[PDB]
Amino acid sequence: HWGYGKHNGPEHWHKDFPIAKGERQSPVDIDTHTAKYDPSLKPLSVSYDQATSLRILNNGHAFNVEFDDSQDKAVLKGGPLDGTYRLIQFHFHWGSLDGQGSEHTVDKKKYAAELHLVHWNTKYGDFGKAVQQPDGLAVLGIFLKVGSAKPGLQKVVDVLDSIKTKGKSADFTNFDPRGLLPESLDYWTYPGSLTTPPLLECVTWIVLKEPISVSSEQVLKFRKLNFNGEGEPEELMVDNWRPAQPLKNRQIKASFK
Numbered sequence: 001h002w003g004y005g006k007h008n009g010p011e012h013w014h015k016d017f018p019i020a021k022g023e024r025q026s027p028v029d030i031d032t033h034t035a036k037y038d039p040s041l042k043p044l045s046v047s048y049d050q051a052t053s054l055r056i057l058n059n060g061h062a063f064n065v066e067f068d069d070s071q072d073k074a075v076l077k078g079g080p081l082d083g084t085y086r087l088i089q090f091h092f093h094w095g096s097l098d099g100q101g102s103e104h105t106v107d108k109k110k111y112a113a114e115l116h117l118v119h120w121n122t123k124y125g126d127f128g129k130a131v132q133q134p135d136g137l138a139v140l141g142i143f144l145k146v147g148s149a150k151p152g153l154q155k156v157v158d159v160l161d162s163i164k165t166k167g168k169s170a171d172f173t174n175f176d177p178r179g180l181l182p183e184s185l186d187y188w189t190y191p192g193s194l195t196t197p198p199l200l201e202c203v204t205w206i207v208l209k210e211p212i213s214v215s216s217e218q219v220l221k222f223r224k225l226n227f228n229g230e231g232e233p234e235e236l237m238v239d240n241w242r243p244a245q246p247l248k249n250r251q252i253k254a255s256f257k
Helices: 010-016 151-163 216-222
Strands: 044-047 053-058 063-067 075-078 085-094 113-121 137-146 169-171 187-192 203-208 212-214
Touching (some): 085 216, 137 216, 151 169
Antiparallel strands (some): 053 063, 075 085, 113 137
16 A cells, blocks of 8 residues: 555555646645735634544554544634634654655755644535545644754653554543644645645645744654554654645745735
8 A cells, every 4th residue: 555665655656546646736845935925815713722632543654643523622714714624633744864854845945844733624514525625624734843842742752652553543632732833823825635645635735934843852753653563574654755746737825924
């Protein structure tokens, strides 16, 4: 099945998922000189006070921090969005070394990692219906650089030993995703896709300009995860990022001057 290797990685995905070569694929390189400031864009509204995390999962690609999305508890609105988008999960992409790992790039710069907070449009009732719509999802992307520790990340890092291998999950309640946000909510936005199969072209991307800092020790713990299942040959969960795809007929807009 699909993965990140030489034989099953991003360049192979198109054979099982031909939209991989579509008109609105993600990620992309954000050329800061050509992204235009759009004064019509609103501030983003991130309302995570009542978010209810439930569980962390090793799905064999990354780990997912899952939320109760059965009510309007943790919602994204504003920005480029019409209506209300409910948080369902977050996950990361990261490298084998600090010089790579992000999916989006900024003037070709790769960050050490990238966090995706995934939200679905409540007008479509559930996530599976939402991903069939061009405005079904809003993904908040946040870059990670290596420097000072991010204290709000440590609880995630803590738990990773318990989900080493594919298929392992653990209770992960009471985790506050606000502790993963940078100070500024300035962003770039563009229409794109899921960055893993099935690569559906259902996402309004909102990529924050300001990275968070995490420590080398935090990231090193991500890199101890495994893509394999229990008792199988160990293959470290690193370099689980899709490279930048062609921008095609799209504009990237900036919320800030």
